Chain length 450, copies 3
Amino acid sequence: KALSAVILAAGKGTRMYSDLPKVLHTIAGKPMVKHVIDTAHQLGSENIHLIYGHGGDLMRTHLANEQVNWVLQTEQLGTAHAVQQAAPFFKDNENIVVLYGDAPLITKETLEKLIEAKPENGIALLTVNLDNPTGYGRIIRENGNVVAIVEQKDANAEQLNIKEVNTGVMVSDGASFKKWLARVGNNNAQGEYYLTDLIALANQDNCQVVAVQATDVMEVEGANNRLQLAALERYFQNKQASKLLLEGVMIYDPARFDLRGTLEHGKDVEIDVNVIIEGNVKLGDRVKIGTGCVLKNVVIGNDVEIKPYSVLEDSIVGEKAAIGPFSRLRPGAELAAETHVGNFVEIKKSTVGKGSKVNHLTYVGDSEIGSNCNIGAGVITCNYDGANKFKTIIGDDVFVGSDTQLVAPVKVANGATIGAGTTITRDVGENELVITRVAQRHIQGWQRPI
Amino acid sequence: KALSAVILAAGKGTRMYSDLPKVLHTIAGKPMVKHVIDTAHQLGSENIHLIYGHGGDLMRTHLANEQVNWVLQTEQLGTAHAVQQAAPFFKDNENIVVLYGDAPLITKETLEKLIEAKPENGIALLTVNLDNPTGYGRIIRENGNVVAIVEQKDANAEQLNIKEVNTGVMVSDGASFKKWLARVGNNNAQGEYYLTDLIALANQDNCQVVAVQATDVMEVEGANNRLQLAALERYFQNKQASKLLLEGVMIYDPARFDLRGTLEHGKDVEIDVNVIIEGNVKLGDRVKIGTGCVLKNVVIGNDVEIKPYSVLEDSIVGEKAAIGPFSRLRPGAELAAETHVGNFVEIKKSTVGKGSKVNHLTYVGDSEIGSNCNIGAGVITCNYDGANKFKTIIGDDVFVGSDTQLVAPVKVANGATIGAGTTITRDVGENELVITRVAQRHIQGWQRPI
Amino acid sequence: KALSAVILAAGKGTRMYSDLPKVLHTIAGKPMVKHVIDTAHQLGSENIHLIYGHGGDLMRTHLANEQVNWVLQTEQLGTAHAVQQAAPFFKDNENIVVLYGDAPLITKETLEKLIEAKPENGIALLTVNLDNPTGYGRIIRENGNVVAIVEQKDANAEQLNIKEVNTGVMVSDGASFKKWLARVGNNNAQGEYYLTDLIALANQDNCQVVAVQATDVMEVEGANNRLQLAALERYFQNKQASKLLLEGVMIYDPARFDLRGTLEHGKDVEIDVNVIIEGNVKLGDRVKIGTGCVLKNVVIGNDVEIKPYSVLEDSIVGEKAAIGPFSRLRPGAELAAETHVGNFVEIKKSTVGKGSKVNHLTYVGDSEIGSNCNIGAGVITCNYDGANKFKTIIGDDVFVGSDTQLVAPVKVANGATIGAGTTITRDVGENELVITRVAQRHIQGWQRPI
Ligand SMILES: O=C(Nc1ccc(NC(=O)c2ccccn2)cc1)c1ccc(O)c([N+](=O)[O-])c1
Ligand SMILES: O=C(Nc1ccc(NC(=O)c2ccccn2)cc1)c1ccc(O)c([N+](=O)[O-])c1
Ligand SMILES: O=C(Nc1ccc(NC(=O)c2ccccn2)cc1)c1ccc(O)c([N+](=O)[O-])c1
Ligand SMILES: [Mg+2]
Ligand SMILES: [Mg+2]
């Protein structure tokens, strides 16, 4: 049986006090609605009907590449009215799952269990037990089936003690949705067409409604403000960290670890406190990440150690390389195996060959450095004024003395030696030794003003 | 009706194992007693009577500027004796609130509710419910009024089950305080004059004592050691973070956020984990603060992004500026709109004009830099030996080549160009190009010792 | 009465998904088994019998220096079989305590209370109360003595409600262990010889088994995976931080503090959030450590302030020194009293004399710097190519101008002055002023390409 999803995402999110619409606020670096779209995709949804409204232009720019059907809602008249906007696109013989852009932690596993329980021509309603169910619609089960969702204000004393409550998440076939949505009324205090009413309509038609309990409450929780969003964030981070720990990643403190994307890892990986992993990150075996590192879109080979307070982005690090502390790898930094990058070093769009070292107070930009080079402290690759970021090409086995400026476009051939304090503007030949001729004034008996 | 406060702050705080007296230990960067003084001020207190004793000289140096009446207590004979020291200064027709220098989280809101409930010629006693009230004085209410505070050792089985306990915080008029304090005795195991006894004395005089429950237990908790102080700190930090989140500040992790002063913010502000905000900080709209930043006494314009591990102090940052990662702004750094400050860059008491860039391994101190300047990597402003920190004045549209030393006092005029590796000691004229003439020795066939 | 310990440490730890055996995973920087060995040593154990098996070679390399008896177990046939491997080495008249390499938080205090309760020719069994005891062996006490350890699958309804459970930790004399271990059978579902059976065997012999409740559950908890290991880590860190706070160390956030070794401290020490203390660290009075610092094997004198994001290792810091922010002290850095080390500064195997300053973008390696020296921004000590890390010797009261390279081996005598941008290769005499003679090309009317 086929499946399609409807995601409610039209909300303004007034209590976020933001220029963004509600569902664009992020959880682990990606919009709340994107988590829901990805879950619906993971489920095998043929179509994903996205109900949107407030901040329409921002929704379109931030989610331009999502394979969704854009259903523009002009008036907020309740959740049944929102779902009915997508109803002309429902296949009669497909299942439809209703999800909420502001409740991002719903899992594929929970939803699979919900779809599976759906009786033919009936509804599968996602429910949850609360220690304090006050304010939520109570689940009334008679003969194993859901006969009513009794709201707080209507419940009798005995019903107020029911801990099982309605989440809003439900599954039914497209024909049943089309049929029942056309029958929902707005005769209530809010004057809204509630999707909740489908339970009563299904019962009127002698169709069964089966309840399916969610594993965690946090899967059904919605974020109405940034405090609630921060609580979903911490729950999501704890869950990601716990999964990594059970896979064998040594995360020293799961409460001080953040994953905002995907992590591929080998065995015996050690991650110290306050590390942030962003985008797509791949770590080989025995990678050690020191305190305070930020890795965004990087590939790290086996046996690499990243020392504290290193920031890496869009970079590749070969096996047994040693980075940090206080190293900065900017996009395009490609470090070969057994390389060394030290404190207060910045590498940008440069390749560094096997065994080469760049250990102090250096800027290497738009360069190619060969194997077994020694880049002295204070070395800087630079350009002439008005240039267009030209390249510095350094061969194999080159020594570059401390505080040397390499003025691109320039080539330094294999085995060349450059003395400290040099300004390199002309190409250096193979085995060429280039040393600066200094002129100095020496004044004897110079008594300091102390 | 007028109000004045009495704050007990004479304690040694032996269990802090410190040379400081008890109340000078800080919560969110300010002494515990200062929080209480500020609360009493926010309430509208005409006078704030500060009872002090231990570490008297340190109290005077650390709180020199507080608008308090210094009441030096020579002997610790109990809380009623402490309050009686200030009693000759109470106005008969004013209300007096008794507060504790070591219980800093008491709120203005709680105290307003306490003052309001105070019956004429009576007492308003602040109380709190505890799940485990063991050791605390139980509130005995008869005919809605507080008839007794029954201590742990005296309570009957039924009274030990009372969860409502005495906090020590109370309000009464100045004449009633003067009258009842003169009647407090010390006939008890400790031989102390307890302020607690005022409840029994008020009852003897047929004056009503009304109980007022505190909203949070943490408002009445006192810190006797640094473990307790750390628990008040975390509660205070969580409360500050929660308020900011409800105002619309996106704090990624409220458990990894510290505010030690005041924060003024615009909309869509994003604060990553492990950020510290000190003194008075103002952030405009859409300010993004990366992980590990420290902002102390700074003004940050709209649309500024501060990248990870940046430390800013007594600085101003114009709109759309980009700072970090690993940037250091020291006092007097003034960055104009659309400026760029990069990694391993230190700016001290310098103004940097619109669109100017200082992106790598640079020290700029006591300087004025104009608009659209390019400050190369490794550039350093310096002085002669025995100098008195002279100024470097750089005009508009100046290019300063990498690893150039600018020797103050020096002026570089508009549109000047400075080549890499230069030593600037003489003023550079408008559109003047200054390039270093290098002498180099080139030795061919130099085989490295590898 | 003498004591010896047996520690079970043969486990593979399959669920760690690691190449290391189970007990080598660390808690606070040291292997789980090492914590247990140290506890057994603190107790006064004459012998420590270490049962090992999986990852035998790694156990031997990682614990080479431990004063233990290496008992190589070839087959895992249950805990009684493991303890019996060490039994030929038990003295009849000594007490034997059985401990587990994967339950590292067991305290000396708990074990002292266990040994003390041991009745002659009997057993002292360590027990613990659990709110949910499901799955654990229930303690059956009859006439004050332990008559049985009833397993989950055998317990009657009434016995399942017993909250007191078996921990596996026990004490008995060597003769009793030898005797009872020879009588343990493997007739059970697992076909293993359980140490648990010693309780039933002691009862058969009319020897009393006394229960001793552990203070904390976490002392008896074992780590089977890295999630469980992380929970023991956080509990251990919280306990260490709480002890330090009660001793008077101001730890701003005990949940963001890590101690991985030993800390000796004076009074009025302040430690900001996210600090890591490794190896042996000693702090004097009024030491202030800013956010994000890492101190490994360092001695810090009184009144030192370490500013944020400083990494120190195998270094000594004299009184009133000022370090950071962003300073790096590498092994052998020895800073005398009243010295100053600033941002983006790296000190390696160098001594820096009293009052000397190294405040910006500098590398000082293999050097001796005297008193009251001024090391300018951008200064670098370096070597010739093929050198063997030679020394830079700087006297007292030397000024070294910004962006100067000091080419070791070189000596700079007392009161010498070095101008900015200099290359020092030759020794500088007492009171010698060395300034660079620059040649520059000046081109007027150079219009920039803007
Ligand atoms: O109803 C919406 N979202 C929604 C619905 C239900 C819940 N459920 C709960 O929070 C919940 C339920 C039961 C127990 C605990 N929490 C959480 C969020 C909704 C409606 C229209 C919208 O447009 C949007 N949106 O995302 O903008 C959300
Ligand atoms: O009594 C003092 N402080 C004080 C008094 C009461 C409390 N209250 C509680 O801790 C409390 C009460 C009820 C329930 C929970 N906590 C906390 C602190 C006091 C007295 C003399 C002093 O000199 C100082 N001081 O600040 O140095 C404090
Ligand atoms: O049994 C072993 N360890 C062990 C034994 C008991 C416990 N106890 C508990 O976890 C416990 C007990 C009671 C209540 C709560 N937790 C924890 C760990 C064991 C046996 C053989 C081994 O070789 C190793 N090891 O360390 O590799 C451990
Ligand atoms: Mg330099
Ligand atoms: Mg230079």
